[model samples]
Target chain A: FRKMAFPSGKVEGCMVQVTCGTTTLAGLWLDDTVYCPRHVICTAEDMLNPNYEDLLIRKSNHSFLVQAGNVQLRVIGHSMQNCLLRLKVDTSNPKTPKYKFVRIQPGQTFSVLACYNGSPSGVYQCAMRPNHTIKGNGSCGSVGFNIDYDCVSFCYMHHMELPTGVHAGTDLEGKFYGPFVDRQTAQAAGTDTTITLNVLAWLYAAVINGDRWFLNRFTTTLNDFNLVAMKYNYEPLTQDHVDILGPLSAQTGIAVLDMCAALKELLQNGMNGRTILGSTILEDEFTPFDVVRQCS
Target chain B: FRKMAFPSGKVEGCMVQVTCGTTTLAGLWLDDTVYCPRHVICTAEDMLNPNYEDLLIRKSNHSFLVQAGNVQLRVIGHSMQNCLLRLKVDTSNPKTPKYKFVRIQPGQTFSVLACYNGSPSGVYQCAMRPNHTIKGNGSCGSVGFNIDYDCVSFCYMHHMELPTGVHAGTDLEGKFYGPFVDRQTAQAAGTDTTITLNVLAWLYAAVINGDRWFLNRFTTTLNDFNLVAMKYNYEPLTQDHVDILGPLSAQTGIAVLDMCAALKELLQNGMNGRTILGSTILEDEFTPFDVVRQCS
Candidate 1:
């Protein structure tokens, strides 16, 4: 079995390489030694879904009343050796707060544990990624995710899909940032034809950091919707873009225009009570799109 | 004179303390090494006053323009360290290519370089931070000023003047977000005692971050306005409240709202031709009090 580390190697190649102990492998066993892709599978999971329902950020500062049915959740962070999920208070304040360890295998849904400290009124941040790899424990990749309690806003769209290619050929998905719904389209419309999902993931990181001026400019001129292969649609700037966008968009500084757009569209859909362009309307009971549309 | 480095001590009462080697001293000398109190200086030199001349993002992905006046600029990386800023073109593809930096610093502003790598467009993204300190060879605390190329929509009202206490306290002179004008007194009511500058700063940050809930609560309950004393001007929160609000508001996801609020305020102020509260207003500009009156 291999353990994933953080900030190791480029995302263009697989993180694991098979090798035998210089000494011996006599201690090998099937269940223990034979690691399957499922053992390494890591996909965003639903917090409310019982089977994959581990996604949770216990009350650190604020309380979650689950105003609606189980909050649909996703797991995004660096995929590397010995990585564990952590809930931190703030990036500026990195004091040792409560933390929880969870495993995130590729293509598999895992419930996240959010360690809620007692500072409910202040700002609380949580993330999941490769741990135990700070100083080269294992050469893998790392990623992170966050949510805001006060705004009650998730970093990205509650439910969205991306191409499978996003996790391919790379130890880490890199970074991403956006409310993007198309991946391949962004690559096709840009100057770079061979834009890898890895690059898109990092693009997301760039977006989250307000690096959107260029990416936004690039996407503005290019038709992201027309570019992605019909099969690999709904991801923008590849996966890297999505990765970076997560944290950046989660910050209170990000423009609500996108959120406002999402809300408007969601509200329109809810009002019509029908899906447009074959897209499903995101209608949760708590903070329903309709309520937000009206109040906002 | 001392070389600049990251703060290396975990000592209490210290936020960031950089250390320098004796060898790297620039021969500049200070009379006494005293961390004294001073107004958080907002040198007009640091403002990005673009010439409003031209704008373009070249093939190498550089977006820059020359404004009418001098502007101070700083470049920073999100997850990278000391980087150099370079302008390089894509050798393989010309039409599909662009120019970007090879490297630069994290959170530090770089002085303007003479000529950019042969490119028509002024667009440049700092690839990383420079190896040595940008302020000087050895000065750590010394600050500089320059215009930013990419940040054209950038404008600052009055800077939030942070006090130099036992530690460099948080800047409270200006805010990251805003309602642009004072909400309560549309007519600019109250003496300096009733409407204090400190409250103005705090309120600005709160409004920009979309903390309407808190703004409503604080506005109603805040009885007196005291600008000078940092200690007992406001009501203290109970440990229970601190425990709740601390982490609740500490999330970076929520912080973006503040940033966006600030951005919108600055942009709007520019568009409206107004002075941001304690600053000089243009001839035909919309003053805060005037805008408030119009809104009311």
Candidate 2:
């Protein structure tokens, strides 16, 4: 806790040691840059966070995904006229194409009832949209005028009596950008055919935003590994480091070397047909069936 | 972000990949489990959080470290009566023997000005001890009555306009346990003789609290890797996987194999004798003189 160091210098007072040659990285893991750490399995329990509001975005033009399992609230927006961000709030039918746009100025906030999974097949869905017809209800929209300030939208699980087997609370987990009016207000949010694409890019941006020099460090490591490998005549494996380990390094803020030792335990596990991930490996996360087929 | 799946499923449109064999891990990184992923280096920039109050501990028995760079606030308390947890808020001056107690109840809170880097040979120092002479300022001590409701404390950098060359801010990061009052209040917190010792254990507990069965999983992996390594008769390296990679994986929450290849690049770099850490390595973080002398 005191140190930001993970697998810190010493555990229980014993110094740690990681010493692997260039093979695992340059050969296998990095071999398929597009399919490693395929599914960084995490605990199913939500990432416990202090913020409970469905969404809390204090900065404009940020993207965020507020979810209670599969029921997620995907929102993205900006003040620009062509704020291409879209909010996602719809059922997973043949094609969930319900994308909404949020309109607001620097000082204005637009609220909306994000409804989904209605009874009569294909009914109820909204985004960070609210002109709650009710004056001062966080928007200029005139629809939910009757929706009480206390009357929550279908999306706010805590306030609503959720359906069976559905549970959601607050957690400090995040995926992209966001900007809320305040701790107590929810503004406009959307999603479309390419919503996931934009969201993914936004997510990538959100990550590197904090670690501004990440790209620089990553590319440098990729090249540095190459030079080191060539010196040792392990040239064949150098490209694997960049293609695979590059993105993997960013996934966990851990240093590059540490990640190498960590993988052996998994390779050992994979040989036994188990997983280094959680209880179950999310094998389906990776696309390109050919790649998985090869590993399988 | 959304995926807890680091290199989460797909970044932008392409999925991530990681492939490597047993060598780097079994041969190098895992070879020295006793010293792997040493000092999981992190960004110098504080983990920007939403809570800034000096120390916030609502739960009766919990530990926490609140810091800004080298200036840190450490607090630990338990209602067990034998509450051995301690608080750390003192100058780096040698032999900092200023350990205090925080007598708090489930519903009560304690407060104090954690002062450090003082003048005239350590004139002032305190922990979560305070009646504040001010009637309702969160504690029971009766000193500093003249200290107004708005009167600032030494540790509160923002209120004091901190001395030349000092800065602090709020961020969401933790090392142990904590429970604070509502969003706007600060509470009691503590540190002692074997303080660092107990604090470390408490920190360990805090981490596993959320990931409850971590120990079970860890020990299991140690053994699992051993068996897998032996299945291939790489008996010599089985222990290495447990010793090194065991803790490394826990450092960043990334899966095992991914960590392996990640280390390869570093190993290649280490061959050149540099570091995979920040701009520089905090090499001193490790203690054993033999290890460093050898690695160096």
Candidate 3:
């Protein structure tokens, strides 16, 4: 199955040949369920474009689902806390950016959930009051978060007298990194606009705390960015391939066009030698995804 | 006073001259304040570097400010709630991204205050649930808010099957200009990261409501970006000048080095001539910041 073209429209993903006993495996069968895997749903489509390769294995007790339809990922894997992970988001759109509000403004776009094990929590930047008068009004015009080196930086503009006084908490004192993440694009895309769902919310709280570096750098940075994104020809997808597969499709539930057709058959059966995600579909790299490495 | 070199580090701005009631005007008078106006602050330094131009005048009722110390503005001007406006921020630092919280995550950095009169409030984007299991838990990975074309866009990474369901409200349907604003930088600025506090927040709700297009496009986008930023050369100041003067120094409270030495004395007392904010120091085109144009 391969009928691509997206902004989230027209899609398809299929790549099979399972056996399990005598050994002959390679799976990624999105939608219209038929396979015997009880759960596994990958995507990025083009039927994994460049060819088939097990996008990622080890069903950590099976229930795997990865569907990054616009692709723009950059994960080194690290989301482990308790283990049983799950995260789904769509914010019904008004242009996406609404999270339990009392007041959330400045080119809005929100999300920062962690604790499935990655911990992280604490944020506040208040100082906006007026009926009249403006001499450093409520003053707190400086904020902090350091949940491990505060990121999610952007939507800025206030250089007057340099952080003059009242600062929130966390830490950004003298300043060196942070601010400018509010561009407003697509109908535009890049050069600038903003996006940092903090590594897809720490790969969805390291898979609801199943952390093993979020299931081992979520399949080794999707098996070496699918061998450097097959030198570029995934058919047609850009914005740096959606910035790089958007935090590996929000917590690798594996679905970037079916993890690019199961990593084009894990790089055409291992680009010739040792690069085969653990000498043949992660045979056991100290317990990979966690079980059915691959056998048909 | 032109001792430039900033990130709020080695900054300097000095431009002098004053006179009211008999006329002698040019005014940018930052710091040591003696010119006898009571107030009027501005910055971006190097004394406004490339030859000054009155940053933004009116002193509203008289305390005109604009300190966008970084320089990345795009203002058009609208906020007009009450009339007597005021707002100052600097959430204390920690890498900047905390805005009053109960729950705020995914690379935080917040600020959205309006109603001195352009009226725009409503934001929420929550959808994160787990204890165990992964089948559309508390689904709400979709949000909405349209305070006049929503855009604080950035910090993104979630491309699974395309915003599949559970939408929040306001409106986004399929999607186009939201998400991707969390990069992390400097020692590295552009290419990607995020920044969009919505036109310095309609120049701070168009000055709490003095709104005549926020003192007229915050002094006409700071006198055409400094006559196009002095064709070039405001001497040292870039993470994009502090990502472009922290939103013209938070709400045209005026101060990007005294709006660059009052826009280098309003483009050498008027670039080629004829845009003199309303015939030299806003003599009163219907209402110029009102009272005292700048005199002897």
On lDDT, the leading prediction is 3
| lDDT, each prediction | 0.20, 0.20, 0.23
Interface RMSD of 2: 27.2
- Per-residue CA lDDT of model 3 for A1-296, tens digit only, reads 00000010010112222222222222222232212121112231322231112323332322322223232112222111111011222211122211111222321221111101111111122111111101112221222111111122222112122222211111111221123111111111112211112222223333333332213222334445545444432222334443445454545565444444444443344433222211111211111111111100
Candidate 3 residue B182 Cα shift, in angstroms, is 36
- The docking category that best describes candidate 1 is incorrect
Candidate 2 lDDT by residue in tens digits, B1-296: 00000010011011001111110100000111110010011111211232222222332212322232233322232111111112222323232122221222111112211122210000011122112111110110111001112221111111111122111111111111233211212334321111111112222322332322222232224354435434432222233333443443464354444332232232233323232221121111111111111121
Q: For residues B10-127, what per-residue lDDT tens digits would candidate 1 score against the true structure?
A: 1011111211112110000011111101111112232233111111111122221111112211111111011101212222111111112222212222221111111110111110
Residue B85, candidate 3: Cα error in Å is 46
Query: Estimated TM-score per prediction?
Result: 0.19, 0.16, 0.16
* TM-score for chain A, candidates 1 onward in order: 0.19, 0.17, 0.18
lDDT of 1 by residue, A222-270 (tens): 1333243222332233333344334434543333234333333322333
Give the clash total for candidate 3.
197
**Which residue runs of candidate 1 sit more than 4 Å off their true CA positions?**
A1-96, A100-232, A235-296, B1-39, B42-296
Where does model 2 exceed 4 Å of error?
Answer: A1-154, A159-296, B1-212, B216-296
Error of 3 at B278 (Å): 25
Question: True-contact fraction for model 3?
Answer: 0.00
